[PDB]
């Protein structure tokens, strides 16, 4: 997930948490480094 985030959005991650939801879907919480802004990256991606 770390490498995929870096390669897809050109953003570095400081930590990745993962869980599997009751519907067997893997959900990841990726904390970006303080250099980047999560709101800006989300705006660029589209989900906002």
């Amino acid at each position: 997930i770390k490498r995929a985030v870096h390669a897809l959005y050109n953003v570095k991650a400081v930590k990745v948490n993962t869980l599997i939801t009751p519907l067997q879907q893997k959900k990841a919480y990726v904390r970006l480094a303080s250099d980047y802004d999560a709101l800006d990256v989300a705006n660029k991606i589209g989900f906002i």
Binding site: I20, P22, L23, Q24
Partner: protein, 50 residues
């Protein structure tokens, strides 16, 4: 149980997905006979003998 196995969790997830009301637009298909989901399950009445 809270401390379970991944395979059991997978089976439970599939059962959860299957336990769902039938889409309403299915009744408008040509030749349709299904009026509801006849395989719904209640956690307290019928138990998955896993």
């Amino acid at each position: 149980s809270a401390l379970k196995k991944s395979f059991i969790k997978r089976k439970l997830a599939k059962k959860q997905k299957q336990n769902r009301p039938m889409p309403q637009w299915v009744r408008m298909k040509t030749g349709n006979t299904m009026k509801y989901n006849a395989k719904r399950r209640h956690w307290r009445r019928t138990k998955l003998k896993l």
